[PDB]
Amino acid sequence: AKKSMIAKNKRPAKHSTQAYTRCERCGRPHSVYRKFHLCRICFRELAYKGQIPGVKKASW
């Protein structure tokens, strides 16, 4: 039931608390970063491609 879920999320929420974040790239509801509007999967995928400016593997 993905497309309908993606569409319904796009529309304004009837009540403020009901608005939630999905991955804009794939629609995943869980583990969506606010800075990037991406889930952990797409984030890791695109960070590898070098298409998320400023992000690189962290080591210390």
Partner 1 sequence: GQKVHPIGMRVGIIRDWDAKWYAEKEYAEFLHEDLRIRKFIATKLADAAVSTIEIERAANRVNISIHTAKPGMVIGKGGSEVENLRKELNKLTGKRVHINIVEIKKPDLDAKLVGEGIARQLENRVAFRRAQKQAIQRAMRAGAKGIKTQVSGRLNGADIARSEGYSEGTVPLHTLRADIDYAWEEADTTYGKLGVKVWIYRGEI
Partner 2 sequence: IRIRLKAYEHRILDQSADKIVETAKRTGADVSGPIPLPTERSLYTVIRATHKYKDSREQFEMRTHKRLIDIVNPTPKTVDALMKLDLPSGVNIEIK
CA torsion angle for 19, 31, 10, 36 (degrees, to 10)? 110
2 binds partner 2 (CB under 8 A): no
26 binds partner 2 (CB under 8 A): no
Name the one residue in this structure whose structure tokens are 């890791």.
Answer: 44
Give min distance, CB of 56 to K ion, in A: 25
Any binding-site annotation on 27? no
Tell me how far CA of residue 19 lies from CA of 11, 46, 55, in angstroms: 9, 26, 28
Q: Which C-beta is closer to partner 2: that of 8 or that of 30?
A: 30
Binding residues (CB under 5 A) for Zn ion: these are 23, 25-26, 28, 39, 42
